[PDB]
Amino acid sequence: MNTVPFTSAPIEVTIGIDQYSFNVKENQPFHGIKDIPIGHVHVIHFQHADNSSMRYGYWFDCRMGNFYIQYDPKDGLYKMMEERDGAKFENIVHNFKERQMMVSYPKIDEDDTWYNLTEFVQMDKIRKIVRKDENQFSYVDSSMTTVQENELSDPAHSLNYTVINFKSREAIRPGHEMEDFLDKSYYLNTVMLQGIFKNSSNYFGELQFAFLNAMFFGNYGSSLQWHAMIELICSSATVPKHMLDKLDEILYYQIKTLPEQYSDILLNERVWNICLYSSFQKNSLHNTEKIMENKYPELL
Amino acid sequence: GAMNSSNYAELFNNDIKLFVDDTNVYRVTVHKTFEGNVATKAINGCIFTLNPKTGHLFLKIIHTSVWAGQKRLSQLAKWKTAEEVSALVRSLPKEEQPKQIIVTRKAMLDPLEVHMLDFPNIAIRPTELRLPFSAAMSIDKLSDVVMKATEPQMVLFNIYDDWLDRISSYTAFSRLTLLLRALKTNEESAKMILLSDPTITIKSYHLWPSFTDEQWITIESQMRDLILTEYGRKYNV
Numbered sequence: 324m325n326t327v328p329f330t331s332a333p334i335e336v337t338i339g340i341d342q343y344s345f346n347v348k349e350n351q352p353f354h355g356i357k358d359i360p361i362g363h364v365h366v367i368h369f370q371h372a373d374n375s376s377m378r379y380g381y382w383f384d385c386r387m388g389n390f391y392i393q394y395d396p397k398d399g400l401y402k403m404m405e406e407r408d409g410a411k412f413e414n415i416v417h418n419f420k421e422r423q424m425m426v427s428y429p430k431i432d433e434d435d436t437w438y439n440l441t442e443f444v445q446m447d448k449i450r451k452i453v454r455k456d457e458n459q460f461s462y463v464d465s466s467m468t469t470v471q472e473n474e475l476s477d478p479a480h481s482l483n484y485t486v487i488n489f490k491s492r493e494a495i496r497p498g499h500e501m502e503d504f505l506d507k508s509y510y511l512n513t514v515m516l517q518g519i520f521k522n523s524s525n526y527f528g529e530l531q532f533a534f535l536n537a538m539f540f541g542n543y544g545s546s547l548q549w550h551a552m553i554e555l556i557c558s559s560a561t562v563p564k565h566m567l568d569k570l571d572e573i574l575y576y577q578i579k580t581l582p583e584q585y586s587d588i589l590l591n592e593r594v595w596n597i598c599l600y601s602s603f604q605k606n607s608l609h610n611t612e613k614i615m616e617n618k619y620p621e622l623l
Numbered sequence: 624g625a626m627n628s629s630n631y632a633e634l635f636n637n638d639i640k641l642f643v644d645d646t647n648v649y650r651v652t653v654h655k656t657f658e659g660n661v662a663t664k665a666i667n668g669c670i671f672t673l674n675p676k677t678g679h680l681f682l683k684i685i686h687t688s689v690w691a692g693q694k695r696l697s698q699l700a701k702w703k704t705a706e707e708v709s710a711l712v713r714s715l716p717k718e719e720q721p722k723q724i725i726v727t728r729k730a731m732l733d734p735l736e737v738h739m740l741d742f743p744n745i746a747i748r749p750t751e752l753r754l755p756f757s758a759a760m761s762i763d764k765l766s767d768v769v770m771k772a773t774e775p776q777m778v779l780f781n782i783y784d785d786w787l788d789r790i791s792s793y794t795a796f797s798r799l800t801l802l803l804r805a806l807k808t809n810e811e812s813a814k815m816i817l818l819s820d821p822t823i824t825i826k827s828y829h830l831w832p833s834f835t836d837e838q839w840i841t842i843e844s845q846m847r848d849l850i851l852t853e854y855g856r857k858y859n860v
Contacts, residue, residue, distance in 0.1 A: 490733070492740050500737045501702035 325385030326416045326425070327367060328355035329401075330393040335372035336401065339380065339539065341365055341437050342580060343429055346372075354424035355392070357416075359385060363437060364444050367392070368539050369401050378540045379464035384446040387459045391415075403460050439576040440535065443528035452483050452532065463536050469544035482536070482544060485519055485529060487551045489558075506603070508561040515555065523566050526552070527573060534577050537589055550594045557602035567607045574611040578618065586619050596623055626725050627751035634675045635792045640723040641681075643708055644671040644756035645731055647769075648685050649700035665690050667769045670704050671759045672711065674721075676792045678783030682765060683707050684772045705734035711777075712742065721745060727754050755800055758807035761814070764830050784829040789836065798843065802831070805846040808853045816845045 335349040340356050347353045349372075359365060368380025381403040383390050388405045389412040395402050406412040419425055430437075446459075453461035469482045488494060494510045495503045503509055520526040530552040537546035556562055556570055581589060599605060599612050600623075615623065626633070634640070648670055651663040668685040689703065690696050712720050723746045724739075726732060736747050760766045768778050783795045790798075805813040823832045834842055854860075 490736055490740070495737055495740060500706070501699070501734070504733070504737050 324358045324428075325361060326355060326357045326420075327359065327383075327385075327403075328391045328412075328416055328419055328425070329353055330391065333394045333396070337370045337372070339366070339368035339370075340428060342440075345426055352424055353426075354419040354422075355416075355426075356428055357420060357425040358428045358430075360428065360430060360437075361385060363441050364446055364449065366535065366539060367403070377465050379462065380539065381460045381462055382446070382449050382453070383460035387446060390460055403458075403462070405459060436576065436580060439572070440580060441531060442573070443524050444531050444535075445528055448525060448528050449532060452529070454479070454481075454483060463540055463542065465540045465542055467542060467544070469548060471547075472544045482542070482548075484533060484544070484548045485515070487515070487548075487555055489555075506558075506560045507555055508559040511555050511559040512561065523563070523569070527569065531573060531577075538577075538581060538585075541588075546589055546591075550591045553598060554594050557598035557604045557608075560603045562604065562607075567604060571608045571610050574608065575614055578611060578614050583618070586622060590619065590622055592622055599623070625749045625751050632793070634796065636676075638723065639674070639719065639721045640676070640725060641708075641721045642671075642673045642675060642725050642727060642754070642756070643704065643731065643735070644673075644727040644754070644759070645701060645704040646728065646757040647671065647760055648704050649690070649696050665696075667772050668700075669759070669765070669769045670707055671756050672708060673756070673782060675796050678781045678787065678792075678795065680780040680782045681711055682768070682778045682780060683711070684769050684776045684778065686772055686775050689775070701731055701734045702738075704731060705738040708735060709738040709741075712739070712745070723748055725750050727752075727756055755803035755807045758803040758810075761803075761806040761810050762830055764825075780830065782830065784826070784831055798839070801843060801846050801850075805849050808850055812849050813846065816842060816849065 332347045332351050332353040333349070336347050338345050338347055338356075340359070356367070364382055364384050366380050366382050368378060370378050379400060381390075383403065389407075389409065390403055390405055391412075392401050392403055394400070406415075446461075449461050450456070450459075453463060455461065463482070467480055467482050468476075469484050471484065471486045471488070473481060474486075489504070489507070489510075493514060494507070496509060499509070516523060516526060520529070530549060533545045533548040533552065536542045537549055553570075553574070556566070595615065599608065599615065648668045650666045650668045652666065653661060653663055656662050665687040667687055670681075670683040670685065672681040672683065673679070685700075685703070685707075690699075693699055708724065712724075720742075722744070724735065725748045726735060727750060729749050732747060732749060739745055739747060760769065765780070768776075782799060783792075786795045786798065802813070802817075805816075817832060823834060823838065825832050
């Protein structure tokens with residue numbers, strides 16, 4: 324169990340750690356989060372009390388280094404930093420724990436939610452979508468645009484998700500125009516899975532990462548990417564049976580975890596109605612279809 | 624974006640463009656089977672691809688053998704249309720290729736867009752106009768070449784005959800759409816108007832009769848009468 328200490332909390336802020344969140348008051352004696360489960364990526368995220376705009380945060384994996392948070396009064400945000408001196412870090416953490424100035428990562432033993440949301444998400448893949456190679460952790464916020472959004476403007480601050488476009492030469496073999504447009508299996512299986520992602524685990528990892536950025540930061544280009552990756556699978560007549568079963572589990576836990584009051588903006592009516600009721604895979608997502616119908620029957 | 628009444632003169636400017644109408648590509652007669660079920664029999668069809676500035680018509684005849692052993696023919700017909708339009712564009716010299724293709728039915732947008740991916744600079748547009756090109760098969764010489772075809776064939780026409788020697792392409796298009804609208808609303812009466820006077824003939828190399836300017840005014844007036852009457856009937860007003 325690892326720890327992310329905070330130097331201080333000079334501004335009033337709602338702090339998120341994965342699917343949990345805590346309010347901290349201005350200059351409250353808060354010095355970090357302890358008992359963070361090892362084995363998963365995590366995200367620590369922020370919304371200032373005075374500007375409910377720009378949610379922002381950091382993806383990290385405590386196995387990769389000792390990380391802490393420190394407010395910067397010049398740039399006006401809580402920043403993640405790595406502490407390279409191992410004995411200084413242990414000493415800071417032990418003092419803050421002794422003074423009981425840390426919140427505990429509040430995981431219920433029965434609860435597999437975070438594992439289910441991050442099953443295929445790896446830090447090394449996050450760091451290729453979010454390029455800042457001098458850090459082991461990755462910053463994301465509400466406003467960052469995707470490579471595909473930019474094509475349609477600062478490249479260093481982009482989300483380099485894999486570009487998917489159903490009306491593209493990449494998606495459509497010359498001479499198979501109708502076949503490939505109406506059945507996307509060659510684009511899914513040959514172009515994307517065999518060619519670009521190499522395996523379905525990397526595909527699901529990017530899909531799960533896109534969902535989490537949409538949910539935690541309201542990042543619109545991430546929501547576009549999540550839906551596109553769902554649609555590419557559902558619009559393929561030929562998908563490996565293990566992928567469809569895993570997809571149904573992935574989406575089930577995403578829909579279960581989504582705030583009930585954000586379904587209006589984070590869920591695309593066309594994609595979901597097409598995927599659950601018209602597509603090739605309309606009968607292959609039983610768990611997702613059941614939770615969608617009982618939780619969001621309006622959308623459909 | 625979409626072509627409508629507000630940007631109508633754009634049709635007659637100097638950027639090459641083509642209208643594509645697919646309404647006569649897949650044609651069937653519906654009939655009863657010996658067992659009392661219903662079946663269809665396809666007949667020859669055509670793609671209607673028209674330059675509204677020059678009158679040049681690229682009539683691709685769709686022979687019924689295209690449909691043999693295929694499923695979902697109404698859907699295939701859109702993609703076959705798109706395949707043939709794309710093949711036509713590739714066949715044209717660069718300086719003859721269109722800068723825009725306007726489809727008369729919105730369901731043709733995605734099929735044509737996908738087939739034209741190789742031509743990212745050719746715009747594929749819908750229209751808000753209700754153009755009467757489905758009535759192309761009411762032009763006797765066009766219907767005759769479609770029905771007689773024994774194989775896929777492209778036949779080239781000028782749908783304006785020699786009108787552009789005397790009138791502009793805006794006026795020629797207006798005459799064409801009036802003639803076709805009339806033929807579409809009451810084919811029998813429209814055809815009666817166009818031939819009633821046996822002294823006005825159709826040249827071997829033309830589609831329509833050789834009317835003088837004054838006779839075209841009479842003709843055009845008879846077509847507008849036909850259309851309005853029909854309309855009061857259709858709607859009882």
